[PDB]
């Protein structure tokens with residue numbers, strides 16, 4: 001058989017992306033794979049994105065929404081169980097993302113929805129208010145294979161989608177790919193019945209129809225670690241701060257705050273999630289600990305826990321500025337979250 005059909009029972013984007021990556025690396029040359037999956041509360045960003053610029057990382061952290069960086073290109077999307085994902089993989093030179101797009105459009109047609117491709121990566125439906133995006137796609141290719149993965153909005157919480165994709169206003173000068181915002185809708189507005197299982201079946205049937213074969217589905221469960229080469233290491237990396245946050249392209253952040261005890265402005269340059277240069281400007285009446293902080297920050301992780309550690313470490317040699325340092329510490333954490 002040339003097909004493989006894989007259905008995930010995990011709702012963890014890190015698990016599901018690691019499965020996708022290991023399956024993809026190990027895929028025989030002649031195989032075509034369909035992988036069908038969902039993620040609970042997640043924002044997934046493209047390989048070259050800056051999370052702090054592209055989504056509300058602070059709100060996500062408060063609400064236990066997971067950040068996942070994927071290996072494909074493109075922008076930032078929100079997943080909950082009302083969102084369904086597909087991945088189609090194939091070897092080159094056969095691989096062509098147009099084929100899998102047409103398979104999804106055929107599945108939607110079979111369910112009674114008329115959609116069409118829009119721009120490079122969207123599927124859109126017509127509504128009384130104008131065209132709405134129900135799907136976003138992204139792609140990855142190597143010398144000898146490709147995959148096309150994308151979403152379908154069935155019954156996603158669109159108020160949460162907006163919330164986590166509306167970042168705090170920050171002075172970030174950031175390299176990387178920026179998201180392209182659209183107006184979206186749920187398929188449930190067109191088909192009130194519609195379920196994840198129904199959509200998975202329709203996509204499955206259209207995949208089988210296109211290729212002229214059927215195969216038995218294989219279920220992948222987080223209850224048994226998948227016996228895929230390098231799974232443990234891939235999963236650990238996919239889960240890590242260093243991958244999801246630290247892989248952001250080089251950027252600068254200009255942070256500033258007025259305190260009762262004076263103004264502080266900080267300029268961080270960040271590369272690979274570390275502060276490679278920090279500069280402090282202040283009119284505090286006791287600037288010494290702030291000057292000490294500026295030198296000590298070089299090499300520090302751009303992350304609240306480590307920044308607060310550096311602020312608070314100054315209490316030993318600057319105990320008279322405890323009030324200032326604790327205010328600075330709490331502010332700075334909130335400013336980089």
Ligand SMILES: Nc1ncnc2c1ncn2[C@@H]1O[C@H](COP(=O)(O)OC(=O)CCCC[C@@H]2CCSS2)[C@@H](O)[C@H]1O
Pocket residue numbers: 044070074075076077078079083085086121133134135136137138149150151152153161165178179180181182183184
């Ligand atoms: N879940 C989802 N589905 C469709 N569109 C969405 C979704 N979430 C947000 N959006 C809208 O798309 C834009 C961003 O569009 P943009 O074109 O910038 O990015 C994409 O579409 C990326 C698709 C990635 C698909 C992968 C599938 C497996 S893991 S995630 C966002 O600002 C909203 O307007």
Ligand SMILES: [Mg+2]
Pocket residue numbers: 122133180181182
């Ligand atoms: Mg868009």
